[PDB]
Ligand binder design. Structure first.
Ligand code: HEM
Ligand SMILES: [Cl-]
Ligand SMILES: [Cl-]
Ligand SMILES: [Cl-]
Ligand SMILES: [Zn+2]
Ligand SMILES: [Zn+2]
Length: 196
């Protein structure tokens, strides 16, 4: 009944708020690591004398720089979702008291905030998927230049890129969980209105 559904909706929102925090914190860890890996790449690229290696490392570096902008956009998208979550909280606490009374604008605002957060999480997801694909492409490029012996510095770059992919995967994993929570928030909140 409604008591149990209000409890579930409350619990889902608390979980969502924690997950959003963990996402943002991971983005900041991803920024740090990307910045650190770019330092190593720029040095390696500059020091490279083999044409093949130099050209590959320049393409990786070019695109890693672009990752910094994409990650900043991802973090701005997560912050916006946090701002909307605040508003869901305040409007939801008012809906707890008012219910369906008065005109529909409060109800609609809360539904519209939820729709907007779902759209932000889809954007965030897509931007993260774009970064992770390209990070994987840079693994494949590094492997092209890692034939034979030596390549010690290249192996260090590869190891860092592999740690990056681990983190990006975790980022997408949390985003998918967050999107699932938002679906459950929608379903439970719809049930709350249906039960009146
Ligand atoms: C991202 C999606 C959503 C989030 C984070 C969210 C969050 C919240 C929060 C924090 C509350 C106040 C809980 C409390 O009383 O302490 C609330 C209340 C409520 N929400 Fe949502 N909500 C979401 C989507 C929806 C949708 C789509 C609907 C309806 C279509 C809905 C209907 C309600 C209703 C009826 C209440 C009042 C009952 C209550 O306070 O427990 N919510 N929501
Ligand atoms: Cl260079
Ligand atoms: Cl070289
Ligand atoms: Cl590439
Ligand atoms: Zn990257
Ligand atoms: Zn690339």
């Amino acid at each position: 009944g409604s008591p149990e559904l209000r409890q579930e909706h409350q619990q889902l929102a608390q979980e969502f708020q924690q997950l959003l925090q963990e996402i943002q914190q991971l983005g900041r860890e991803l920024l740090k690591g990307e910045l650190q890996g770019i330092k190593q790449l720029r040095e390696a690229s500059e020091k490279a004398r083999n044409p093949e290696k130099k050209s590959v490392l320049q393409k990786i570096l070019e695109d890693e720089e672009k990752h910094i902008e994409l990650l900043e956009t991802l973090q701005q998208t997560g912050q916006e979702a946090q701002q909307l979550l605040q508003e869901l909280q305040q409007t939801g606490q008012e809906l707890w008291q008012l219910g369906g009374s008065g005109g529909p604008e409060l109800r609609q605002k809360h539904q519209q905030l939820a729709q907007k957060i779902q759209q932000l999480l889809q954007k965030h997801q897509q931007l993260g998927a774009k970064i992770l694909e390209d990070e994987e492409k840079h693994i494949e490029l590094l492997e092209t230049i890692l034939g034979g012996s030596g390549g010690d510095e290249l192996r260090e770059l590869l190891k860092g890129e592999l740690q990056g992919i681990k983190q990006y995967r975790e980022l997408q994993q949390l985003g998918q969980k967050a999107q699932q929570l938002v679906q459950k928030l929608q379903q439970t909140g719809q049930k709350l209105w249906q039960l009146g």
